[PDB]
């Protein structure tokens, strides 16, 4: 079963895949010469492709006339174009992996000096290393009798040889295998990092569908992320057991992740108050905490988690109505109060949790002030002598007589091992909360420490208070509450509304009632050139912007309002950076019309301390709310957030990576270009086929024909491969079909 029709099948195959090849691989260098002032790395490296698919190209013809007719160029010709093969794929391969380091480093140009030094030298070490290992390829070929006709052939020497092996492995391994596996490093971990920036990870999974999730957890709340001096990440939530509300079981809890936010260790707990066993209502039958702010101060290195507390009930909705005195002072020392079952009186907490009377006589009652059990969960346990009775945090139901105002607190807690373990939370609200106020809470997220200024050095906490004149009704009003003394003491700054005019006339943050006028939850920076800005959630639509002179203490009348940014009434955070030189402010909140569509804005710090927004980037599409942003290093930064996924519930906080790249350029400018994995992909599966039947050629009749038209089509396949290469650059790609088109 033979034909000699494929002796002239050849002659136009080898003429067309021979023109397509030198016509589109000429456009290649043409397209290259009038361009070399902008030419990259990786476009000197598809130059010398080009090169090699050429001179590959260039032998095409001398098959046609073989197959036409008979080989009439010699042995010297015939040895010489089977080596100038090698040239290509050897070349072609270590010219690929040249690519890949390129970008290797790209993703993991800075001065042009050397980008071309250590370009082209490696352009010259490949062809040096390609014509080398392809010498050994003029010893294995050369014209052969064949005993078919008249006819004169050149082709490689049959089996009888095996002194070959010693030779033609090593080609392959070094000019390919080499290649193959560089290549195959640089591209996996080059998809690894684009992995990262693109692709969000879950740091706390909530349930779905309305159960619990593995570890029996309905539902986790309100994100901080933070940025340790070691290089760790923190990540806070509420954890919230049994709902989502703000009330019922919930924890102050943390992951901390070691290596930038790809891996995530167990959760820590801070704090995790005991819940009432008697309580008829379950779902609000618990002590509360709810809503941190996560602050590292420099100097000392001691991480700080502040939180709100209330006693067991509807969180900030089981306050009492009429206002309860919380604290009392007695010579020049300040208590907790402690209201007794049946009497108006105060009693106190004193030294030791030591309850005294009304009138300053001890009782044999105490309060655990000094807990000791994990999470902490024993705070507030009221003995009788060494009884546990109950829980000075309980409001109903209760087995002792004694409980707390019903009140709005302010608890710290504080790391000085990297966030392992957590100091028992202290209690910081009689140094903050003013006689009026009748809530006074943290606006989530990560506060700051002053960097310069006379102030430097002191650390920054927003929260926000209502009074007891319109409540959550009309006097939601942000502040800063601060420590000068590396945590240890704490000072309640101004209000925003304090002295502000509205319309027309004065308002403060103790007496007002004006729904519109509110701020309630917001995030702090400062700017280089010392001031304070605060961004506040508010009501008016847009952003409001309030910014104080003095490190926090007072802010200016006017709060500045940005159209160019939407909120849509949720909270929000921002951060400063610098880059390349500048500032900037970058700021984060869901973009609308309700709380979905995350995204991150971009604004430039003016000379006068004012914004200019520069770009607004969705980075989250769907559910989207709370939020805390960190600066990582390196021109990257990461974003912890609220976020719900087919049937999740709300919310679970997920963690994604971003660089300046996706920051700064427009939507559609990614880069995952990546022509290079086409060529890539091309390069080796049509070379492959060829050269590994050409290996298995070595190791009745008409078995070996199967190997040769094994020879015959993957050598066809190779043959395309020099056409395929110019093809790949216009479509896929981006520069050259641009380039070639402006140039006619
Ligand atoms: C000067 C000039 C005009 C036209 C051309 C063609 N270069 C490209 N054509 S293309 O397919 O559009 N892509 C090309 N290069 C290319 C690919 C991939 C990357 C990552 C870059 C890179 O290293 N950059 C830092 C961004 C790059 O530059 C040549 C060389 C094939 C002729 O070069
Ligand atoms: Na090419």
Redesign the pocket.
Same mark, same amino acid.
């Given at each position: 079963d033979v034909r000699n029709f494929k002796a002239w099948f050849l002659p136009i195959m080898y003429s067309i895949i021979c023109f397509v090849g030198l016509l589109g691989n000429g456009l =290649?260098?043409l397209? +290259?010469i009038y361009? !070399?002032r902008? $030419? *990259?790395?990786? @476009? *000197? +490296?598809?130059?010398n492709l080009?090169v090699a698919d050429i001179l590959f190209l260039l032998t095409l013809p001398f098959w046609a006339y073989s197959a036409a007719k008979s080989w009439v160029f010699g042995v010297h010709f015939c040895k010489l174009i089977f080596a100038i093969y090698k040239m290509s794929f050897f070349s072609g391969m270590w010219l690929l992996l040249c %690519?890949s380091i @390129?970008?290797y480093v790209?993703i993991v140009?800075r001065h042009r000096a050397r980008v071309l030094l250590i370009s082209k030298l490696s352009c010259v070490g490949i062809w040096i290393l390609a014509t080398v290992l392809s010498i050994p390829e003029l010893l294995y070929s050369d014209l052969q009798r064949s005993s078919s006709e008249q006819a004169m052939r050149c082709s490689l020497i049959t089996e009888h040889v095996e002194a070959f092996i010693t030779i033609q492995v090593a080609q392959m391994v070094i000019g390919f295998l080499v290649p193959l596996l560089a290549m195959s490093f640089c591209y996996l971990v080059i998809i690894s990092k684009l992995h990262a920036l693109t692709e969000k990870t879950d740091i706390f999974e909530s349930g779905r569908n309305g159960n619990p999730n593995k570890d029996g957890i309905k539902s986790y709340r309100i994100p901080a992320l933070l940025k340790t001096d070691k290089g760790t990440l923190i990540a806070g939530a509420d954890e919230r057991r049994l709902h989502s509300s703000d009330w019922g079981d919930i924890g102050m809890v943390i992951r901390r992740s070691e290596d930038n936010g790809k891996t995530w260790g167990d959760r820590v707990t801070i704090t995790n108050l005991r819940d009432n066993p008697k309580a008829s209502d379950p779902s609000i039958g618990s002590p509360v905490n709810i809503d941190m702010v996560l602050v590292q101060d420099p100097e000392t290195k001691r991480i700080f988690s502040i939180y709100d507390m209330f006693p067991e009930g509807k969180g900030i909705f089981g306050m009492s109505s009429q206002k309860e005195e919380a604290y009392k002072k007695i010579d020049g020392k300040t208590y907790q109060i402690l209201y007794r079952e049946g009497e108006k009186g105060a009693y106190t907490i004193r030294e030791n949790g030591t309850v005294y009377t009304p009138d300053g006589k001890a009782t044999d009652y105490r309060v655990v002030v000094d807990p000791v059990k994990p999470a902490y969960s024993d705070k507030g346990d009221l003995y009788k002598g060494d009884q546990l009775l109950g829980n000075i945090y309980f409001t109903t139901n209760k087995t002792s007589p004694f409980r707390i105002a019903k009140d709005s607190y302010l608890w710290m807690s504080y790391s000085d091992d990297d966030g392992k373990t957590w100091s028992a939370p202290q209690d910081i609200t009689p140094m903050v909360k003013a006689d009026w106020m009748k809530f006074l809470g943290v606006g989530p997220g990560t506060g700051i420490v002053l960097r310069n200024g006379p102030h430097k050095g002191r650390i920054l906490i927003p929260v926000y208070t209502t009074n007891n004149v319109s409540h959550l009704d009309g006097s939601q009003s942000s502040r800063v509450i601060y420590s000068d003394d590396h945590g240890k003491t704490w000072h309640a700054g101004e209000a925003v509304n304090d002295n502000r005019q509205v319309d027309g006339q004065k308002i403060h943050s103790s007496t007002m009632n004006n729904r519109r006028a509110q701020n309630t939850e917001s995030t702090v920076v400062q700017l280089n050139n010392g001031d304070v800005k605060l961004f506040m959630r508010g009501l008016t639509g847009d952003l409001q912007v309030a910014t104080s002179k003095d490190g926090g203490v007072t802010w200016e009348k006017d709060i500045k309002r940005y159209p160019q940014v939407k909120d849509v009434y949720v909270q929000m955070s921002a951060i400063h950076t610098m880059h390349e030189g500048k500032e900037y402010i970058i700021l984060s909140n869901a973009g609308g019309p309700k709380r979905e569509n995350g995204m991150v804005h971009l604004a430039r710090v003016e000379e006068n301390g004012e914004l200019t927004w520069l770009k607004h980037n969705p980075i989250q599409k769907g559910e989207f709310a709370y939020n805390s942003l960190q600066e990582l290093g390196n021109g990257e930064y990461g974003i912890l957030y609220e976020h719900t996924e087919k049937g999740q519930n709300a919310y679970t906080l997920s963690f994604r990576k971003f660089n300046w790249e996706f920051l700064s350029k427009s939507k559609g400018h990614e880069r995952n %270009? !990546? =022509? %290079?994995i086409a060529v890539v992909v091309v390069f080796i599966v049509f070379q492959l086929p060829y050269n590994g039947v050409v290996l298995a050629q070595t190791v009745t009749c008409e078995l070996s024909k199967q190997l040769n038209i094994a020879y015959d089509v993957t050598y066809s396949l190779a043959c395309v491969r020099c056409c395929v290469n110019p093809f790949? +650059?216009?479509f %896929?790609? =981006? $520069?050259?079909?641009? @380039?070639?088109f402006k140039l006619f």
């Open positions: =290649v260098v397209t +290259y361009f !070399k902008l $030419k *990259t790395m990786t @476009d *000197t +490296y598809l130059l080009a %690519i @390129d970008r790209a140009h %270009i !990546k =022509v %290079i790949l +650059y216009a %896929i790609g =981006v $520069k050259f079909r641009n @380039d070639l």
